[PDB]
Amino acid sequence: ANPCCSNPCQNRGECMSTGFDQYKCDCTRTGFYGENCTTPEFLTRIKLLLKPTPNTVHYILTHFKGVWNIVNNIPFLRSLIMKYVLTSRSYLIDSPPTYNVHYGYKSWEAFSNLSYYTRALPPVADDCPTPMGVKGNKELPDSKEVLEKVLLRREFIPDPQGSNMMFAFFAQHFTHQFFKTDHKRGPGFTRGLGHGVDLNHIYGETLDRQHKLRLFKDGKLKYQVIGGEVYPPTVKDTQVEMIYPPHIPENLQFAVGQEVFGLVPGLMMYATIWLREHNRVCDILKQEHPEWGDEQLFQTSRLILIGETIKIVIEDYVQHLSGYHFKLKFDPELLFNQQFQYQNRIASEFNTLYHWHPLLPDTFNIEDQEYSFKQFLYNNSILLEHGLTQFVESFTRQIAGRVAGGRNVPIAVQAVAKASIDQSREMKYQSLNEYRKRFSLKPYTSFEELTGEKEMAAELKALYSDIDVMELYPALLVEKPRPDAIFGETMVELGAPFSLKGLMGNPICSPQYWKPSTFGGEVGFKIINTASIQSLICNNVKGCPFTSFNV
Amino acid sequence: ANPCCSNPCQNRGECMSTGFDQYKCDCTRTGFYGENCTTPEFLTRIKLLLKPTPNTVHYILTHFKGVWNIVNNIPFLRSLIMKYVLTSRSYLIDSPPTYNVHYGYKSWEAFSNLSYYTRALPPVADDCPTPMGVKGNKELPDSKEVLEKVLLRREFIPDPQGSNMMFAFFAQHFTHQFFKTDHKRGPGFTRGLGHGVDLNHIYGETLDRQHKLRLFKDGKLKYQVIGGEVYPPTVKDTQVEMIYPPHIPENLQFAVGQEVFGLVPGLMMYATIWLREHNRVCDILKQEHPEWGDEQLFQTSRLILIGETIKIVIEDYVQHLSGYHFKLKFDPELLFNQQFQYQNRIASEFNTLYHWHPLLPDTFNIEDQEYSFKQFLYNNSILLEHGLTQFVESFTRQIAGRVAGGRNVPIAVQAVAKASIDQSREMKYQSLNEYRKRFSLKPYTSFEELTGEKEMAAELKALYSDIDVMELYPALLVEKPRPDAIFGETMVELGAPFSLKGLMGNPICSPQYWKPSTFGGEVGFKIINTASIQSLICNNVKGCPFTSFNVQ
Numbered sequence A: 001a002n003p004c005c006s007n008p009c010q011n012r013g014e015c016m017s018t019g020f021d022q023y024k025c026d027c028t029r030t031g032f033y034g035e036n037c038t039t040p041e042f043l044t045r046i047k048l049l050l051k052p053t054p055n056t057v058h059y060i061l062t063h064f065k066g067v068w069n070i071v072n073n074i075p076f077l078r079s080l081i082m083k084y085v086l087t088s089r090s091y092l093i094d095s096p097p098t099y100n101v102h103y104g105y106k107s108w109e110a111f112s113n114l115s116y117y118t119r120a121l122p123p124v125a126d127d128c129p130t131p132m133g134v135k136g137n138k139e140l141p142d143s144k145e146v147l148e149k150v151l152l153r154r155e156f157i158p159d160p161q162g163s164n165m166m167f168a169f170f171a172q173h174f175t176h177q178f179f180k181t182d183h184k185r186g187p188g189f190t191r192g193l194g195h196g197v198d199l200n201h202i203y204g205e206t207l208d209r210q211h212k213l214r215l216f217k218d219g220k221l222k223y224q225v226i227g228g229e230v231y232p233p234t235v236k237d238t239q240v241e242m243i244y245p246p247h248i249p250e251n252l253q254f255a256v257g258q259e260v261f262g263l264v265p266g267l268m269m270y271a272t273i274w275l276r277e278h279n280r281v282c283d284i285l286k287q288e289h290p291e292w293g294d295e296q297l298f299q300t301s302r303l304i305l306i307g308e309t310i311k312i313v314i315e316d317y318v319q320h321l322s323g324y325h326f327k328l329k330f331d332p333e334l335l336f337n338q339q340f341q342y343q344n345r346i347a348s349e350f351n352t353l354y355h356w357h358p359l360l361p362d363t364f365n366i367e368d369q370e371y372s373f374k375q376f377l378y379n380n381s382i383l384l385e386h387g388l389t390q391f392v393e394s395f396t397r398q399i400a401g402r403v404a405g406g407r408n409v410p411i412a413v414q415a416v417a418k419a420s421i422d423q424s425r426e427m428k429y430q431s432l433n434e435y436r437k438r439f440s441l442k443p444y445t446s447f448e449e450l451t452g453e454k455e456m457a458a459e460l461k462a463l464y465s466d467i468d469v470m471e472l473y474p475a476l477l478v479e480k481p482r483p484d485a486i487f488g489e490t491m492v493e494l495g496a497p498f499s500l501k502g503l504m505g506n507p508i509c510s511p512q513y514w515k516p517s518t519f520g521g522e523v524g525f526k527i528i529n530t531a532s533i534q535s536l537i538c539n540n541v542k543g544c545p546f547t548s549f550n551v
Numbered sequence B: 001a002n003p004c005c006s007n008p009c010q011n012r013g014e015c016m017s018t019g020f021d022q023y024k025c026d027c028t029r030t031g032f033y034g035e036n037c038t039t040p041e042f043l044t045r046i047k048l049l050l051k052p053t054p055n056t057v058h059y060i061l062t063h064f065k066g067v068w069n070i071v072n073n074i075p076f077l078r079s080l081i082m083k084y085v086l087t088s089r090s091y092l093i094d095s096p097p098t099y100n101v102h103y104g105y106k107s108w109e110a111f112s113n114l115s116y117y118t119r120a121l122p123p124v125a126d127d128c129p130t131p132m133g134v135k136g137n138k139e140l141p142d143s144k145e146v147l148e149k150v151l152l153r154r155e156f157i158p159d160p161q162g163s164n165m166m167f168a169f170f171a172q173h174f175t176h177q178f179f180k181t182d183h184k185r186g187p188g189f190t191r192g193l194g195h196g197v198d199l200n201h202i203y204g205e206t207l208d209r210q211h212k213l214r215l216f217k218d219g220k221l222k223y224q225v226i227g228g229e230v231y232p233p234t235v236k237d238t239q240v241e242m243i244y245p246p247h248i249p250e251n252l253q254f255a256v257g258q259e260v261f262g263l264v265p266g267l268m269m270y271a272t273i274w275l276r277e278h279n280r281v282c283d284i285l286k287q288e289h290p291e292w293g294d295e296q297l298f299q300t301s302r303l304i305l306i307g308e309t310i311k312i313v314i315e316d317y318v319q320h321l322s323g324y325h326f327k328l329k330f331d332p333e334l335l336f337n338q339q340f341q342y343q344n345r346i347a348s349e350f351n352t353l354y355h356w357h358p359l360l361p362d363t364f365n366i367e368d369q370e371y372s373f374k375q376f377l378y379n380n381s382i383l384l385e386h387g388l389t390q391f392v393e394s395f396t397r398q399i400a401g402r403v404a405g406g407r408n409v410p411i412a413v414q415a416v417a418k419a420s421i422d423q424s425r426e427m428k429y430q431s432l433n434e435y436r437k438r439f440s441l442k443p444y445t446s447f448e449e450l451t452g453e454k455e456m457a458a459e460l461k462a463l464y465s466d467i468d469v470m471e472l473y474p475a476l477l478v479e480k481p482r483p484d485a486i487f488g489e490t491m492v493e494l495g496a497p498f499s500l501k502g503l504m505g506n507p508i509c510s511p512q513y514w515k516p517s518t519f520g521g522e523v524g525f526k527i528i529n530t531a532s533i534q535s536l537i538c539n540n541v542k543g544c545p546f547t548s549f550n551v552q
């Protein structure tokens, strides 16, 4: 019924109903004009030719290794390139934010209510004839069919980039601070009202939860010592709410910032490391500031660990993931002379993009064991038996699964994968091609172009019929990867602007915050600017074992 | 004990202790360096001579009327000048915000916790020997003696700029959407978590309160008809909580967005006008979009009224208040190629600056009556008696009081005026001169330089002794006014950046929002861009009386 159901407005033009069967496109500042914002202005047509494809840019960044080696050691050049990466990506994101699951038009409710995930593309209206608008059948294909035909893992496909379990568990730990779905309200809602890197997965979302986790001396967090090793305190001791089955022994009911980190020993591993890191920084700051109280030591440590997290995410985590030969740099100063909004709202699609279910291995190899999923879930005793040292060494060696390329989702989490499809439809996501156009990508013209092969493409075609009806989430997993890479084009071009906007959008990246005195002097500041995934383990893991995000 | 109690660092340098008796100044991006950030870098001293004093700039905008008459009719030149007005002010404000009443250092708690008012200057530490840091006596002078000697009104001093009660009540109505003190937590806390012009004083702070105020038909708000006139609904039939004394009959307990707007008939007047305006726009939008449901009609009307408010504040309200001959312009497009943060956090000092108690008259004159404060308080029957037309006409004619100049706080609200002093001390405000330096002003060297006279200057020196111990709030009410103006330098120079930041910082001023389609098309868009205080009254007050923010 809604005339905007076909998504007629192109090039990020805004559709508005002007009657019962009439619409108008707002091409304001789109660089286009006309009824559908399809007719390019003069300067627009020029930029369209000079601007290369994402695959071309990706190729350059992943080749000419010797050339980039020169670039990386030239500060002025490295800064200029990183600056371009930051600016060009962030312009894809609406900031301040616009739509959510309940509003396909802008409203104060959609802007002010922080309980919502925001939306890069508005939902398909309720009165639309088809789930994707007007294209496709009355109903999308069976989610179970799609899951089994092109998603479920037949044989474990390893990651050509060699991402290890240290990478996988960092990804889940890191992103669990801003993807906290409020299942009470629905998939379009979040409990992470901070909408970014606040480290609530360490310090708790609320003040009362924080205060229960704090020692209230020397700025430190509460902890217990088992076998000489520092671990998070217990539920019984702190009285913070954690999610554990009732049979878990008291000393194994670890109390941490995120209530679900007791689900996975891998998550509790990083939880322990960051806990130790916080208290380590507390020791450092106190030595520098013996005149400081417990409150200032705690708050200053937190700001430092926020910095450390962002530093590691960019220069180690993303650096590995991208496959670039360019040395990515975390440097807030790059944006000081640029137009940039220091704020962020977590996008529902970014949560969807991050559903990297194929990442998970068949078994979790630790030391000389090979635990299954049923053995791994809610079993922190594995963490205590082997210790952090053994965990780091084991997880650095074990390879993870390939996300794109189709047919690699372990059946142990098939219910979760199916839910990603269902909840995407429930939230009325637009199609793959509409999201591709939203991020300046060419729409696929066939399922074979999408997957790069014939077998899976044929199964998809029998299911969806029209390529313009292909869903975003399943496509991400079946997409034709980049040459010897973990991801396809769509995963990167969509996720990277969500990511960098959330990293650099942090208030500690703003010029008033990005000062040494903010972090307790040059000593605190250096901890941030020298942070790495290696030093974090070296500075929290016994014996200081080697580690990286690849095998 | 804290080695930063003396406020040593200057030019917005940040002080940090390094020992029990040692401090270091962070001069990053200040343009200065040295131990106390007082050594100007090469490019800095250059601008130090190229930058005119705020009094000079004010002189230019308040003179050469014939010249501005030429400038105002040249769109390029007008926009360019207005562009300078917006940018030069907003750079004084920390955005994202920094300190609050409990944090004199940056912390995630101070940033993330929206229940705090933010602070332009950090609080004086608790372990400091004196309230101002190290200067002055162990305790500040008696607030009662300060109030009585230099603040209390002997004889009414009318505003030389001719501000009326329409202005006075608009100020109180408009600002009480973001100045909503959480008295249960303290004077440094707020209940306005929107921290800006969200119009919660019309629609309600919470979704729950909003829904009870809504008709859920044609996007409209609930209303009742009394004598053929549209008024807000009652507490009885909406169940929204309002603050009323128990002797007020339920039929007179009007329910609106802000729970305290029943306190003053002048507030309830604007609440009605804005209620009517909302439903007026819903009618207009429905005509343009018969295919729209109730929810989109309500929401789109809210964005438009937000636009209307900001438009009127700038082009009418601030326009009159500033005294500028230059025509101020509400144009979000002016900031699209400028570095600007579309976000705002309400500053505790902005609230303190807006305690315009001397604005209040001795009596509230409606038609032929002269209601005292006791009679005017919580008396909505006065509104139903005279009406809205007579209210607008009467308030347009009655002049308001001069804020600066000293001794003009009416006695009826002396307790409130004393609270403003005491709570500033409770929140550990830094001195007047510290706030002047914080906003690129020159510190006063004597109380005489502050007041511009001798009698009150002698009173204050006997109380404060040192000029560097003079408090911010009492100074604003006794400061030497600009030539025939309502305010002194400190008021305008401190407040204007807070204001423009909160106005332009609204998300609807951002490029993705500032589109016709955001407001339902060109018809809705035009309501914003042609709004004014007169049209607001004309479309919603019977008879369309002639109104203004000043008397003839």
Ligand SMILES: *[C@@H]1O[C@H](CO)[C@@H](O[C@@H]2O[C@H](CO)[C@@H](O)[C@H](O)[C@H]2NC(C)=O)[C@H](O)[C@H]1NC(C)=O
Residues within 6 Å of the ligand: A113, A114, A115, A116, A184, A185, A186, B206, B207, B208
């Ligand atoms: C954000 O939006 C949600 C969803 O509309 C609000 O939650 C609803 O609140 C109303 C009344 O407050 C209830 O009747 C609904 O049952 C709630 N729905 C859900 C799914 O929880 C929420 O109150 C809004 N938040 C704010 C701060 O306004």
Ligand SMILES: *[C@@H]1O[C@H](CO)[C@@H](O[C@@H]2O[C@H](CO)[C@@H](O)[C@H](O)[C@H]2NC(C)=O)[C@H](O)[C@H]1NC(C)=O
Residues within 6 Å of the ligand: A206, A207, A208, B113, B114, B115, B116, B185
């Ligand atoms: C913002 O800060 C205030 C003040 O610290 C917090 O209010 C305190 O909350 C704790 C824990 O719930 C209570 O024990 C205190 O009694 C409260 N004090 C006051 C003065 O209200 C408030 O919870 C914080 N807000 C958020 C969202 O964390």
Ligand SMILES: CCCCCCCCO[C@@H]1O[C@H](CO)[C@@H](O)[C@H](O)[C@H]1O
Residues within 6 Å of the ligand: A148, A149, A150, A152, A153, A154, A455, A456, A459
């Ligand atoms: C791993 C368990 C999935 C089996 C689900 C039912 C089989 C449907 O999946 C079929 O799988 C075959 C094996 O890969 C493919 O050759 C076919 O293309 C596919 O249709």
Ligand SMILES: Cc1ccc(Nc2c(F)cccc2Cl)c(CC(=O)O)c1
Residues within 6 Å of the ligand: A318, A321, A322, A353, A354, A491, A492, A494, A495, A496, A497, A499, A500
């Ligand atoms: C869904 C997704 C997409 C991209 C990235 N990172 C990334 C990448 F994989 C390539 C280039 C830049 C960036 Cl920021 C990430 C990882 C992250 O930055 O959170 C996730």
Ligand SMILES: Cc1ccc(Nc2c(F)cccc2Cl)c(CC(=O)O)c1
Residues within 6 Å of the ligand: B318, B321, B322, B353, B354, B491, B492, B493, B494, B495, B496, B497, B499, B500
């Ligand atoms: C305490 C205070 C200070 C200044 C103003 N307005 C104002 C002014 F009075 C002169 C120049 C610009 C502006 Cl924004 C105001 C009114 C307002 O913009 O809300 C209050």
Ligand SMILES: *[C@@H]1O[C@H](CO)[C@@H](O)[C@H](O)[C@H]1NC(C)=O
Residues within 6 Å of the ligand: A006, A008, A034, A035, A036, A038
């Ligand atoms: C705009 O799109 C509609 C529907 O997609 C189409 O019918 C029409 O021809 C288009 N107009 C132009 C000028 O491209």
Ligand SMILES: *[C@@H]1O[C@H](CO)[C@@H](O)[C@H](O)[C@H]1NC(C)=O
Residues within 6 Å of the ligand: A374, A375, A376, A379, A381, A382, A385
């Ligand atoms: C938990 O892990 C231990 C290994 O430390 C294993 O022996 C035990 O069977 C596991 N328990 C469950 C319920 O999987």
Ligand SMILES: *[C@@H]1O[C@H](CO)[C@@H](O)[C@H](O)[C@H]1NC(C)=O
Residues within 6 Å of the ligand: B006, B008, B034, B035, B036, B038
């Ligand atoms: C800096 O300030 C301190 C205390 O205010 C003072 O003693 C010192 O002389 C100052 N130094 C300079 C270089 O201004």
Ligand SMILES: *[C@@H]1O[C@H](CO)[C@@H](O)[C@H](O)[C@H]1NC(C)=O
Residues within 6 Å of the ligand: B374, B375, B376, B379, B381, B382, B385
């Ligand atoms: C309220 O106003 C009326 C005039 O309408 C007046 O007669 C009455 O005395 C007032 N009430 C009080 C308590 O002063």
